[PDB]
């Protein structure tokens, strides 16, 4: 390799000479491949666990027992069903009920580990007590949906079985999701309902003005009895209720206290579902998603882990329950566009002419006239944002004694943003009003701005230009995943 280039016969590429023979070429790369390589023992699944609280996950029955066939035959011999290993093989090929029973019994004591394909956080792998599933894709508890860093989109997940007893001890002890509670990076409590569980929690502690039987006063055992059948609603206000809360005031000991707080059906009901220590006033709120996180944090501070898991699971369940209860549809009328901008923009329009007139007068130069037009458009945009906010703030009339009940409406965008589950006023601004400037070919800003809505369509050029931005965003995400990976690689190499 130092002198000459003796080549293989008819092969212009030199034979793997005894000059570079010592080097394997793959050598370190082959070792690196060994560093990230496997074979068979593969899993992957994609479904949601409406059932199966946190201490569980769904493993489909089909590829199930494609693994524990050794365990299956071992049990069958142990049960005497496999007098012969080939007899075990023939019986497994027959798929008897005893086979399924053995599989269930072995798995009944055997949990598994499931993990996400793209790998970023330690939260990407978790251990759950498998439950057999008659499906094709594994259903994961909506608990760690975020912890998987995926969004119910198509993905195969990895399956791991702790063949060593120590492997089982480590996974059930360390890789336990029932152990993984807080975001270990910054310490933030990871377990946080970000899906409509919070939406139901909020809608429960909410009331338009005063529903039927708003003034009803009670004690607690039958509020759901009335609400399920008739008598009161959550959208009711000012329902008096004697509240029995036991707080761990003594050192490791709680004492109860009876109040008579006015509430609604939903807030009082959720108060029962709560754990013990915190005051019911801690629940007595509109029960925001950040407020939900705050309650969760306070609980983890005060109570412990097991009650925390119990509360979180019951919370997911009750959230689904209330969400199915209210419904709260969405339609075009759920977005009502204020018409005020129809004048205001026109007014703002005139201003640009003056700048243009100033630009026509020579007083406003290209930069000066452009800046004047931009400032006028920005002021108009801020005013239109304020106007849209007012038209979509708690700006609604409800029947009342005063015939004027300005409270939280039920326009879909507004209530949804109030909970905060997804989206906010930022997209709602273009939903009915304008999308703002939205001018960036590469870095420059175009002259004409977007005065249109996806409630009102758009001009040719607005759409003509908006898509370059999303294209660039996708391209940047693509280009940046690689650099972040290389960087973190160098870091861990240092670490």
């Amino acid at each position: 390799g130092r002198r000459g280039r003796a080549i293989t016969g008819s092969n212009k590429r030199p034979l793997k000479s005894l000059a570079d023979m010592i080097k394997g070429k793959q050598g370190r790369f082959r070792q690196n491949l060994l560093g990230k390589r496997v074979d068979y023992s593969g899993r992957s699944v994609i479904t949601v666990g409406p059932y199966l609280r946190l201490h569980q996950c769904g493993l489909p029955k089909k590829m199930a027992l494609e693994l524990f066939k050794p365990f299956i035959y071992g049990k069958l011999e142990l049960r005497g069903l496999a007098t012969t290993i080939k007899a075990a093989k023939k019986m497994v090929e027959r798929e008897e009920a005893v086979v399924w029973d053995i599989l269930d019994e072995v798995i009944r004591e055997h949990p598994v580990l499931l993990n996400r394909a793209p790998t970023l956080h330690r939260l990407g792998i978790q251990a759950f007590e498998p439950v057999l599933i008659e499906g094709k894709a594994i259903q994961l508890h909506p608990l760690v949906c975020a912890a998987y860093n995926a969004d119910f989109d198509g993905d195969q997940m990895a399956v791991h079985v702790p063949l060593t007893l120590e492997a089982q001890l480590e996974a059930r002890a360390l890789m336990m999701s029932t152990n993984n509670i807080l975001s270990p990076a910054n310490g933030e409590p990871i377990i946080v309902p970000s899906q409509d569980v919070v939406l139901g929690l909020y809608y429960m502690t909410r009331d338009c003005v005063n529903a039927k039987g708003e003034g009803m006063v009670l004690t607690g055992p039958k509020e759901a009895e009335r609400l399920y059948r008739s008598g009161l609603a959550s959208l009711h206000a000012r329902v008096k209720v004697r509240i029995t809360e036991y707080e761990k005031d003594a050192n490791g000991e709680l004492v109860a206290k009876t109040s008579l707080k006015d509430t609604t059906v939903g807030r009082a009901i959720l108060w029962m579902i709560v754990p013990k220590g915190l005051p019911y006033s801690i629940v007595n709120q509109a029960l925001g998603k950040k407020a939900i996180s705050k309650m969760l944090n306070t609980c983890y501070r005060i109570l412990g882990l097991k009650p925390t898991v119990i509360f979180a699971d019951q919370i997911m369940y009750t959230g689904f329950a209330y969400a199915a209860r209210s419904g709260a549809s969405v339609g075009i009328d759920d977005m009502v566009i204020p018409e005020k901008k129809h004048e205001i923009i026109s007014e703002a329009e005139a201003e640009v002419a003056e700048i243009q007139e100033q630009f026509q007068s020579g007083l406003v130069t290209a930069g000066e006239r452009y800046n004047k037009v931009i400032d006028i458009w920005a002021a108009a945009n801020d005013r239109v944002s304020k106007a849209m906010m007012d038209n979509l703030q708690t700006e609604t009339v409800i029947n009342r004694d005063g015939q004027e009940e300005k409270q939280v409406s039920f326009n879909s965008i507004y209530m949804m943003a109030d909970s905060g589950a997804r989206g906010s006023a930022a997209q709602i601004r273009q939903l009915a009003g304008m999308r703002g400037l939205m001018a960036k070919p590469d870095g420059s800003i175009i002259e004409t701005p977007i005065t249109a809505n996806f409630r009102e369509g758009l001009n040719v050029l607005q759409y003509f230009i908006s898509t370059h931005g999303a294209r660039k965003g996708l391209a940047d995400t693509a280009l940046k995943t690689a650099n972040s990976g290389y960087l973190t690689r160098r870091l861990v190499d240092v670490a």
Binding site: L34, V48, G74, L120, G154, G331, L431, L461
Partner: protein, 1341 residues
């Protein structure tokens, strides 16, 4: 009112207020005209074979007095049918043969021709015939090549500076991209020096090229630099300064203007001073001698007495040398201007930088640069320089490139040669220098004017000429050597290289790829794609981000929403509704003329360059019926700056609203109510669909589907037909009326479609007939309905009843739930197609033949295969069932007493036949579509292939006999008419033909003669029919030809169905998609007020996250259509009067804003009305424009008219506990469709499978026991868990070395669950290495 007999059964309601002016075009003629011109027998050689042939047609000997020419080329017709080639799998093509012309001329005779061999047409390969749908049959395979786009050849005055300068300097670089030949660049270095580079090589001196091209340094300086007289006689130091010529420079001193000093010493140049010095006659004004010091001698002057080189060229004037030149040289000396304020030499600095001053030295520098070795001999340098650019046969860029170069040089004449010009180079350098000093704007490749497109015909012609060049070289060589021959023109005429090149270009090409008909819409979209990647344009996925942005010059050029969402983003473009192509390589978009208030209905297809001039009004411009404008100030764009403009300020009118986006967008409705990200998402999403078992038009339409299906080329069209007589479910006989029945033709069209074809996307291809029997059919009418077609409209999706509301957290935002009845409703059932072929692979040990004689074969296994090893046709197959039993020959042995005893005991095996049987794959089971055997010539088994050949020949004979029977019937009728009124009654002729009683004597002069002529005609027809039958039998039984290895191949395809399951993936045209999550009993579905249990539960929070008004819009539109169909079906069950239903339907269709004019009970006959109503018995068909759909107020009115809430919200009754749910919700019927990715396809598992050949790990291009290997990021994270035991197992169990596999299995079976650390077994193997253990300091402790 349009008759639309094919559409007479189904009328979709309109919602497009804008009156369409231009209909949708063929939209596929873009490629079709390319192939037509490439295969055009053009009288002038300008495109296709006409230009390419004459380019290299003349082949001449090396002064051998021999020449080669071509007379005319004739393309051989295709050998077989398109279906015939596809079934055979052969590459469908067309032969070619050109009447050649070889002339041998006698020596010593000036062109004294001695003989001509212009008598042999030479065949050079075969030309692949492009499909009428534009497809190909490449090796049988349907492949299409993606359209090409690149930068048009020419010179671009680039910038090539900025942060790339890394020194804060502005560069002026120009790149010449000729269409052929080496590339050139002229860069501006930070030292204000021009650097010439060729083929991206090292930079070269600016003055080196000029000196090499027979140009003197004096000539170069004079052309480059402006020279002043500087007439300083008798030491006057008087310069001829013109205040117009030179000004703007502060007058330092010695500034006088025609006597009186108009500019004071030390005074700044004043515009008043310049004006006075120009107005006052300014003669040679005295100037300071200091200005002489800064001056540089322009001309290389000599002393008057001696020809001394004193004050040489490009030499600054020295005061001491000034006196020497004034006394010795002359008085007036040429100088320069050096107006660095307004100019900069940039060449004189480079002229001194140039180390070569002689032409030979400059040429040798070029030779050294191009070839670092092999110095030239004053001839290699000159020849190389001439051939580099100055050779017409070596550069030959283009005439379009010549036009671009002329325009860039502002040369009015644009027709030029592909070779270069020194004047062109000088003009380019001058333009670069001026731009560096400031003269214009830099080029913009992102602008459409900077790019030319290339279609298939251009590439085919280019490949043909490229192949012809090497062949003409060999022809000239063969003429030069042994010219004393009168041989035919086949001395070097080799068809093989031409055919191979044609196949490879058609076959092996980046643009070319197998077709995707996953939707006929998907087919059409894949057909019209435009990509920059390939032979030109985009070289690599890297090296560009602004290349993928929204270019302003493609506003009416490329589809804005549809493009790849993956890494190929930007690289894909799609043509809009009405884009036309420009003259050379570009495209032009039609736009109506806007002339004087009224907009002219005439439109012109205009490109980007012309576009930046005129002002084009936006389409959605309300105009008077006179064309005039209602609003004076209208947003119009003239040069990319649209704003309110006067009625006299607009120059052209747009074409249409659809003129902006491709048709792939045209399907998606109500997108005006949608966001861009989701828009592109859905645009991509529509592609991967597959047709359903049931084909029903989704209720909501846009109007593009029927026309798209017409252009899809997948349905069956009626060409020049009048009435369909005999309709079989495969054979359609249409009696074409004599007006449409051309003379010499009967006037009957026979159509045979293919049923259940394994798709290019492996799906099923089926054409659904719609015509029944004996009906007036119009030419150009739809006949058979391919995949996903319903009432002639593209329907790759079904409108299912649903509502969007959360329920039991059972369905995630990306997870959907379907009610059990819909699963029972047979919806989304799919007919997947699988296949399995075997090859004979005859060996020296012996051929492997299929006879079901599988050694060691169970009876049930042989109980499926038929006698020929293959099986019969019609039932199912389960598991890994063996299909065709091939027997591999095995080697023989000795007398083998034990084996002899076995043969005497068992025998019939002798270990001679190894089971090479075809067996069903694991996890593969289902019904079987069909089988086909192709046997090479020399093997004529036909053991069951004779049954298939018989079937085919019988179909062929049944076809050929119909025409013969019709002809015989016509002849018999003619004969009976000839003998009529001649004493012969029709009863006798009815009894027996008897040849009209064999000229009984109806006239005995003409009746006898007419009978003789008719008998001759009938005999000729019988002979022709018999010859046709014999030839058809010969062709059908012509057999196949297999490759040398396989004597025969038997391909069997089995079609397996598939319904949704836990894990299905549905999609919505509003880009909303979902995973099939949970389906409870249909009781669980919430009950309507009428109890109608909803089917699909969508996520209201997900809809808020989607933030798409179109979804809700789809809900409302589907609700309205379903209600309308419901009232219609109720009336039908009520069996109400046709008049009352007609009135109601007329009220419904005419309801709403003004879009289109239609009224029934005047065009629809009651039977036509009845047929249409029975057709539209379950919905209201509606179509809307892409940006000009109906108004939500019209929707609310229709809901009121449809007896539905204007808001649409409605209460629901629970399906599980039946509690009334507050907040009445709106529901509808949204279109749903499934994704190509399948849950069964995704499912995979493995714990112990088969290992591959490399590194003992499992693999080998087989989908068996597949198992993604662990991830390096995953491994790092796994270590982060600290599960040293688990990680140690994953690296101690999870891979390849089956050595401890036995130990692991034994431990697990014992339940030991134990492992030994041992060594990386492979690092123990790396010790085996250790420089052969050379490094073993290993101090194992």
């Amino acid at each position: 009112m349009v008759y639309s007999y094919t559409e007479k059964k189904r009328i979709r309601k309109d919602f497009g207020k804008r009156p369409q002016v231009l209909d949708v075009p063929y939209l596929l003629s873009i490629q079709l005209d390319s192939f037509q011109k490439f295969i055009e027998q053009d009288p002038e050689g300008q495109y296709g074979l006409e230009a390419a042939f004459r380019s290299v047609f003349p082949i001449q000997s090396y002064s051998g007095n021999s020449e080669l020419q071509y007379v005319s080329y004739r393309l051989g017709e295709p050998v077989f049918d398109v279906q015939e080639c596809q079934i055979r799998g052969v590459t469908y093509s067309a032969p070619l043969r050109v009447k050649l012309r070889l002339v041998i001329y006698e020596r010593e005779a000036p062109e004294g021709t001695v003989k001509d061999i212009k008598e042999q047409e030479v065949y050079m390969g075969e030309i692949p015939l492009m499909t009428d749908n534009g497809t190909f049959v490449i090796n049988g395979t349907e492949r299409v090549i993606v359209s090409q786009l690149h930068r048009s050849p020419g010179v671009f005055f680039d910038s090539d500076k900025g942060k790339t300068h890394s020194s804060g300097k502005v560069l002026y670089n120009a790149r010449i991209i000729p269409y052929r030949g080496s590339w050139l660049d002229f860069e501006f270095d930070p030292k204000d020096n021009l650097f010439v580079r060729i083929d991206r090589r090292r930079k070269l001196p600016a003055t080196i090229i000029l000196r090499a091209l027979n140009y003197t340094t004096e000539q170069i300086l004079d052309l480059f630099f402006e020279k002043v007289i500087f007439e300083i006689r008798d030491n006057k130091l008087q310069m001829e300064l013109v205040p117009e010529r030179l000004r703007g420079e502060t007058a330092s001193f010695d500034i006088e203007a025609n006597g009186k000093v108009y500019v004071e010493k030390g005074r700044r140049i004043t515009a008043r001073h310049i004006r006075q010095l120009e107005k006052d006659d300014v003669k040679l004004i005295e100037v300071p001698v200091e200005y002489i010091a800064g001056k540089v001698v322009a001309k290389d002057y000599i002393d008057e007495s001696t020809g001394e080189l004193i004050c040489a060229a490009n030499m600054e004037l020295s005061l001491d040398l000034l006196a020497k030149l004034s006394q010795s040289g002359h008085k007036r000396i040429e100088t320069l201007f050096t107006n660095d304020l307004d100019h900069g030499p940039y060449i004189s600095e480079t002229l001194r930088v140039d180390p070569t001053n002689d032409r030979l030295s400059a040429l040798v520098e070029i030779y050294r640069m191009m070839r670092p070795g092999e110095p030239p001999t004053r001839e290699a340098a000159e020849s190389l320089f001439e051939n580099l650019f100055f050779s017409e046969d070596r550069y030959d860029l283009s005439a379009v490139g010549r036009m671009k170069f002329n325009r860039s040089l502002l040369r009015e004449e644009i027709e030029g040669s592909g070779i270069l010009s020194k004047d062109d180079i000088i003009d380019v350098m001058k333009k670069l220098i001026d731009i560096r000093n400031g003269k214009g704007e830099v080029d913009d490749i992102d602008h459409l004017g900077n790019r030319r497109i290339r279609s298939v015909g251009e590439m085919a012609e280019n490949q043909f000429r490229v192949g012809l060049v090497r062949v003409e070289r060999a022809v000239k060589e063969r003429l030069s050597l042994g010219d004393l021959d009168t041989l035919m023109p086949q001395d070097m005429i080799n068809a093989k290289p031409i055919s191979a090149a044609v196949k490879e270009f058609f076959g092996s090409s980046q643009l070319s790829q197998f077709m995707d008909q996953n939707n006929p819409l998907s087919e059409i979209t894949h057909k019209r794609r435009i990509s920059a990647l390939g032979p030109g344009g985009l070289t690599r996925e890297r090296a560009g981000f602004e290349v993928r942005d929204v270019h302003p010059t493609h506003y009416g050029r490329v589809c804005p929403i549809e493009t790849p969402e993956g890494p190929n983003i930007g690289l894909i473009n799609s043509l809009s509704v009405y884009a036309q192509t420009n003259e050379y390589g570009f495209l032009e978009t039609p736009y109506r003329k806007v002339t004087d208030g009224v907009v002219t209905d005439e439109i012109h297809y205009l490109s980007a360059i012309e576009e930046g001039n005129y002002v084009i009004a936006q389409a959605n411009s309300n105009l008077d019926e006179e064309g005039h404008f209602v609003e004076d100030l209208v947003t119009c764009r003239s040069k990319g700056e649209s704003s309110l403009f006067s009625r006299d300020q607009v120059d052209y009118m747009d074409v249409s609203t659809q003129q902006v986006v491709s048709v792939g967008a045209s399907l998606i409705p109500f997108l005006e109510h949608d966001d861009a990200n989701r828009a592109l998402m859905g645009a991509n999403m529509q592609r991967q669909a597959v047709p359903t078992l049931r084909a029903d038009k989704p209720l909501v339409g846009t109007g593009m589907e029927r026309a798209v299906a017409v252009d899809s080329g997948v349905t069956a069209v009626a060409k020049r037909g009048g009435v369909v007589q005999y309709v079989d479910a495969s054979r359609i006989v249409i009696k074409v009326n004599e007006d449409e029945m051309y003379p010499g033709e009967a006037g009957i069209d026979i159509y045979n479609l293919t049923k259940y074809t394994r798709s290019n996307q492996n799906t099923c291809i089926n054409q659904m007939p719609c015509v029944s029997l004996g009906e007036p059919v119009e030419r150009g009418d739809v006949l058979a309905d391919g995949p996903s077609t319903d009432l002639g409209e593209l329907a790759l999706g079904q409108n299912m009843r649903v509502a969007f509301m959360p329920w039991n957290g059972y369905n995630f935002e990306d997870s959907i739930l379907v009610s059990e009845r819909v699963v029972q409703e047979d919806r989304f059932t799919t007919i997947h197609i699988q296949e399995l072929a075997c090859v004979s692979r005859d060996t020296k040990l012996g051929p492997e033949e299929i006879t079901a004689d599988i050694p060691n074969v169970g009876e049930a296994a042989l109980s499926k295969l038929d006698e020929s090893g293959i099986v019969y046709i019609g039932a199912e197959v389960t598991g890994g069932d063996i299909l065709v039993g091939k027997v591999t020959p095995k080697g023989e042995t000795q007398l083998t007493p034990e084996e002899k005893l076995l043969r005497a005991i068992f025998g019939e095996k002798a270990s001679d036949v190894k089971d090479s049987s075809l067996r069903v794959p694991n996890g593969v089971s289902g019904t079987v579509i069909d089988v086909q055997v192709f046997t090479r010539d020399g093997v004529e088994k036909d053991k069951r292939a004779l049954e298939i050949e018989e079937m085919q020949l019988k179909q062929a004979k049944k076809d050929l006999s119909e025409e013969l029977q019709i002809l015989e019937a016509g002849l018999f009728s003619r004969i009976r008419a000839v003998l009529v009124a001649g004493g012969v009654e029709a009863e006798k002729l009815d009894k027996l033909p008897r040849d009209r009683w064999l000229e009984l004597g109806l006239t005995d002069e003409e009746k006898q003669n007419q009978l003789e002529q008719l008998a001759e005609q009938y005999d000729e027809l019988k002979h022709e029919f018999e010859k046709k039958l014999e030839a058809k039998r010969r062709k059908i039984t012509q057999g196949d030809d297999l490759a040398p290895g396989v004597l025969k191949i038997v391909k069997v395809y089995l079609a397996v169905k598939r319904r949704i399951q836990p894990g299905d993936k549905m999609a919505g045209r509003h880009g909303n998609k979902g995973v099939i999550s949970k389906i409870n009993p249909i009781e669980d579905m919430p009950y309507d007020e009428n109890g109608t249990p909803v089917d699909i539960v969508l996520n209201p929070l997900g809809v808020p996250s989607r933030m798409n008004i179109g979804q809700i819009l789809e809900t409302h539109l589907g609700m309205a259509a379903k209600g309308i169909g419901d009232k219609i079906n109720a009336m039908l069950k009520q069996q109400q009067e046709v008049a009352k239903l007609r009135e109601f339907i007329q009220r419904a269709y005419d309801l709403g804003a003004d879009v289109r004019q239609k009224v029934d009970l005047s065009t629809f006959s009651d039977e036509e009305v009845m047929r249409l109503a029975e057709n539209l018995r379950k919905g209201m068909p509606i179509a809307t424009p892409v940006f000009d759909g109906a108004k939500e107020a019209e929707i609310k009115e229709l809901l009121k008219l449809g007896d539905l809430p204007t808001s649409g919200q409605i209460r629901l009754y629970d399906g599980r506990t039946g509690e009334q749910f507050e907040r009445p919700v709106t529901v509808g019927y949204m279109y749903m469709l499934k994704l190509n990715h399948l849950v069964d396809d995704k499912m995979h598992a493995r714990s112990t499978g088969s290992y591959s050949l490399v590194t003992q790990q499992p693999l080998g291009g087989k989908a068996q026991f597949g198992g993604q290997r662990f991830g390096e990021m995953e491994v790092w994270a796994l270590e982060a868990y600290g599960a040293a035991y688990t990680l140690q197992e994953m690296l101690t169990v999870k891979s390849d070395d089956v050595n401890g596999r036995t130990k692991m299995y034994k431990n697990i079976v014992d339940g030991n669950h134990q492992m030994e650390p041992g060594m990386p077994e492979s690092f123990n193997v790396l010790l085996k290495e250790i420089r052969s253990l050379g490094i073993n300091i290993e101090l194992e402790d």
